[PDB]
């Protein structure tokens, strides 16, 4: 089925919440920039990446709902847009992973994180992560093709073109499966087990006890919503795997899975900046 | 204690006093005399300035 | 309207029945 | 009999103030309008000195104008080359809490006093490559506020025990001690002639001292708050005091009175350091508003603003020739300004 | 490395070695914790430094280690004219140990020694430099005050105080009123303890307090507080 009104009606408040959260993060980052910790710089980079993916998804989503074919966008345009979207999503998830691991090593070794004033190293790390995200999004974007309008009439195409994955289905399927597994099994397990060890450490450590209990429950709910929000984006690609079965009902349920994955990813990108900067007002 | 302060307050009269106008004139004369040699008042070119971009 | 643009069910436009929304990738 | 002597001293001070006001009919602010005021002066960071891990409290300039010394609270006294931005000497301190610096005119001796009131002096030119401790001065009972080198042999110091005394590196004892200031002295400034000097006490009073005679020559009380910093005019006839109530005053030695004041309603934060240029027409000062401001000694206007410091500025030093100005703040960063 | 000279390369190598040594010393200096001592008289600062007895004019530094952690104390109440001029030097510290006697109110040293200690604690808490740094409260006299409270009540020092005359209630009231001195201070928390005969308990409390403060600072850094 095709529905444009509910998609926009549910994406407008999500986008509003996302831009409001990004504005709040930018405001609290501008305040006391000298006292800002490298973790605050990581959070600012994550917020900028969230804004990038939001303003790359919402306009493209409403344009696709209005017309499936791109409007005033050629092949290089689709290539650049897909590359930017993929690298921004990769940078977001990888920066979340690095934030998790740095929080883990800081709560496990506070003296180690306190010494040496590890500030420029954080900048170099985020730069190398952005570079790795670009280098990983380049091959997945290079494998993309426009078949044709493909109508056996006339002399020219009637302005119909899609920016799909026209490359052989086996290679693209293997690439998507490898990407989905390497971006779900490894980093989700990392952020789960590291935050679980943090939970055990804070429970062994525990005015102070209510704060520790609140931190523990917020940790639990954060990992829960992170799993529940990053599960659809990969169950979609797994549904792409090994089963095509071109029909009407399976196509309909696949489109429903796609739109629910999209709205879940949108709400996740909107809630991440406001849920990561809840403890610290600055 | 008190005698030290007494002598300190008493020794302030023997010092000669000049008008503020003469001191101000000497100050501005010394300022304008070394104004050309002052690098802060007039910027120097990069070829002569030891500090460059 | 067979002489129209598409006039067939397989078409890139909306309301086709196949996968309408492309994956986010 | 103390009350009658106090009344006599008060009457003498009132008579001195009346005599000073009688000859103070003219003001410097009414004469500077004739001379052409200096235009807008802008300065940028020539080189950003990196390698500090704590706040920088004081710094001094050498006669060669190429090497500067700065102290940090971590316990490392680093000597920097202003031209190439290189650490020529970095020495550890026994007491990490250090509040002042000093650079000998010869260029081979450096001293840094701190909260432990041990004015440790170091000999740069030694047989071995590493710098070693030369002498330790612990006669003072208060924290060393500021120390200045009279010459290679003698050094004058200012401590938190409301008294100041000059030392001898070879001897190690106070030959002359000045105890006229009742308030806590915070800064010390040496004259180019080295014959006299002035210090700023916390009692809103800065007095003139003689290195040879050892007595109080003239006392200047024109401020309303404690004097945090003080500098001396290159001419030798006047000097400026940087207090903590956001105002600066230029006192004249011959006039024995405040010639004029530098007061701006926009700034309410105190002054941490006061410096002067080569000619003296342009004096610089650092405030608690995270940046130092450039002031005009004659026209009394803010010539420029030198921003870009992450923390509060504490020290401010100008070279002898006046080629560049080094500004040090609590953000562990030294910046060179033209 | 576009332009290379003999003296230039020598200076560059010397600066690189000096920077490496400075980074190593900072890594060694950041591992240890710096905690300030405010005696408010010659009764409190001497008690906390004498119980450990392990080491390695002006302020003194007592560097002692415990549980693979280097601690150092700074006795700054030896002889000081103005306190507001050097408090900014200790702006960045791990914690602050404030030692005050319980039975010092009966002696005058300006109307009341206890009132002077209270006003000093207020001036310390209201300092803009010690807003983030926590303050640890130590009570030097425990048994002496417990014996003095039987003969000398607490109502003489505090007329507004109301309650029983036992030592426990008086100590609890003193702890609460000392915790009351802070005004609009939520980032820092006050730790109060009573000194006992054995030093192991005091050292353990100090270590636990510094560990909790470091954990809270790390959580505020990472954004979990």
Residue numbers in the entry:
A (entry chain R): 42 to 247, 258 to 333
B (entry chain C): 11 to 63
C (entry chain P): 1 to 25
D (entry chain B): 3 to 340
E (entry chain A): 2 to 57, 182 to 234, 239 to 354
What do the authors say?
Neuromedin U receptor 2 (NMU2), an emerging attractive target for treating obesity, has shown the capability in reducing food intake and regulating energy metabolism when activated. By activating two GPCRs, NMU1 and NMU2, NmU peptides are related to multiple pathophysiological roles in diabetes, metabolic disorder, inflammation, and cancer.
Here, we present the cryo-electron microscopy (cryo-EM) structure of NMU2 bound to the endogenous agonist NmU-25 and Gi1 at 3.3 Å resolution. To facilitate expression and purification of the NmU-25–NMU2–Gi1 complex, a hemagglutinin (HA) signal peptide followed by a flag tag was introduced at the N terminus of NMU2, while the flexible C-terminal residues of the receptor (Q356-T415) were replaced by a PreScission protease site followed by a twin-strep affinity tag. The overall structure of NMU2 possesses a canonical seven transmembrane helical domain similar to other solved peptide receptors of class A GPCRs with helix VIII unmodelled due to its flexibility upon activation. Compared with the inactive structure of NTS1, NMU2 adopts a fully active conformation on the intracellular side that is stabilized by G protein coupling with a remarkable outward movement of helix VI (~10 Å, measured by Cα of R6.30) as well as the inward movement of helix VII (~4.5 Å, measured by Cα of L7.55). NmU-25, the 25 amino acid endogenous agonist, forms a short β-meander structure and the conserved peptide C terminus penetrates deeply in the entire orthostatic ligand binding pocket formed by ECL2, ECL3, and helices I–IV as well as helices VI–VII of NMU2. The receptor and peptide ligand form an interaction area of 1214 Å2, and the C terminus of NmU-25 (form F19 to N25-NH2) contributes a large portion of the interaction area (930 Å2), while the N terminus (form F1 to Y18) is accompanied by ECL2 winding alone to the extracellular milieu, leading to the outward movement of ECL2 compared with NTS1. The last four C-terminal residues of NmU-25 (-R22-P23-R24-N25-NH2) form multiple polar interactions with the receptor. Residues F19 and F21 of NmU-25 pack against each other through hydrophobic interactions of the side chain and insert into the hydrophobic pocket formed by helices I, II, VII, and ECL3, while the main chain of L20 is stabilized by forming polar interactions with N109ECL1. The αN helix of Gαi1 in the NMU2–Gi1 complex is rotated by about 25° relative to that in the NTS1–Gi complex.
